[PDB]
Amino acid sequence: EQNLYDVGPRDSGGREGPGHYIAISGNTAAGKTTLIETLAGSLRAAGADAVGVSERVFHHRYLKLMFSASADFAFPIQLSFMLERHLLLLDNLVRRGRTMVMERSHLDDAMFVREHVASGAITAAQQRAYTEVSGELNARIPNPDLIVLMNPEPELSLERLARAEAEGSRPREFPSDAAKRAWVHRWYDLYQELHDDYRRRAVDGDLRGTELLELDAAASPEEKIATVTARARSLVVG
């Protein structure tokens, strides 16, 4: 539908350079997928060669082993998230000049490695190797142009996840109810810190030139799309 994996030649008319890059950043079950699908379609309607990319597009077949056998599979599955995200950005955003609406940015993945390092599932030496590769990959990808900061409270995430799992609309990914609850909580705390770092990064760090937009994860989906569209519409190029 969106031609995400085309190895053919660029086709951007006379426009040069990468497309523009919108990232929706926050913990699981915030409403990001819902927002991304609508936003990508709205940008296409405005004339942009835009695509919306949820991580489920590139989830590894071995995903569940990261959560059931983390000291064995957290390191390579985290490498997978990084690498598959990178390749989609390198091709769609950079090579082909398309506009990207993505679940998370390439800057979010390092926080998920930090969680496994803190728990002991990934070693410090493994993290150092990850970071070396991450730095080389990230150097080839432009910063996001708009980061939407939408971090849900843990009990909100878990309420939404429990309903979806119970209705069969999403798979159960964790080895126990407690493992799901605990990862959601540890990720929430790390996301609060990551977003505070992003706020400083955009002023005094390497994200100068990037716009940040705060969004309450408890807002209605229609309020979320209205709020994000009011900033994303400015980024449309034909």
Ligand X SMILES: Nc1ncnc2c1ncn2[C@@H]1O[C@H](COP(=O)(O)OP(=O)(O)O)[C@@H](O)[C@H]1O
Query: Is residue 24 a contact point for ligand CTN (CB under 6 A)?
Result: no
The distance of closest approach from Cβ of residue 231 to ligand CTN in the complex, given in angstroms and rounded to an integer, is: 24
Can you list the positions of beta strands (E) in the chain? 21-25, 50-53, 99-103, 146-149, 211-214
Residue of 6, 165, 173, 211 that binds ligand CTN (CB under 6 A): 173
User: From CA 237, how far away is CA 229, in angstroms rounded?
Assistant: 15
Total Cβ atoms within 10 A of residue 79: 18
Picked from ligand X, ligand CTN, its own copies, none, the partner binding residue 95 (CB below 5 to 8 A depending on kind) is: its own copies
User: From CA 230, how far away is CA 225, in angstroms rounded?
Assistant: 8
User: From CA 32, how far away is CA 34, in angstroms rounded?
Assistant: 5
Picked from ligand CTN, its own copies, ligand X, none, the partner binding residue 5 (CB below 5 to 8 A depending on kind) is: its own copies
Picked from ligand CTN, ligand X, its own copies, none, the partner binding residue 164 (CB below 5 to 8 A depending on kind) is: ligand X
User: From CA 154, how far away is CA 184, in angstroms rounded?
Assistant: 6
User: From CA 84, how far away is CA 72, in angstroms rounded?
Assistant: 20
User: From CA 133, how far away is CA 64, in angstroms rounded?
Assistant: 24
The distance of closest approach from Cβ of residue 33 to ligand X in the complex, given in angstroms and rounded to an integer, is: 3
User: From CA 157, how far away is CA 21, in angstroms rounded?
Assistant: 26
Q: Convert residues 98-117 into a mask of x (bound to ligand CTN by CB under 6 A) and - (unbound).
A: -----------x--x-----
The distance of closest approach from Cβ of residue 151 to ligand CTN in the complex, given in angstroms and rounded to an integer, is: 12
- In the bound state with its own copies, the residue whose beta carbon lies nearer, of 136 and 159, is 136
Cα-to-chain-centroid distance, residue 236: 20
Query: Is residue 28 a contact point for ligand CTN (CB under 6 A)?
Result: yes
- In the bound state with ligand CTN, the residue whose beta carbon lies nearer, of 115 and 145, is 115
Picked from ligand X, its own copies, ligand CTN, none, the partner binding residue 60 (CB below 5 to 8 A depending on kind) is: its own copies
Picked from ligand CTN, ligand X, its own copies, none, the partner binding residue 68 (CB below 5 to 8 A depending on kind) is: its own copies
Can you list the positions of beta strands (E) in 90-135? 99-103
The distance of closest approach from Cβ of residue 32 to ligand X in the complex, given in angstroms and rounded to an integer, is: 3
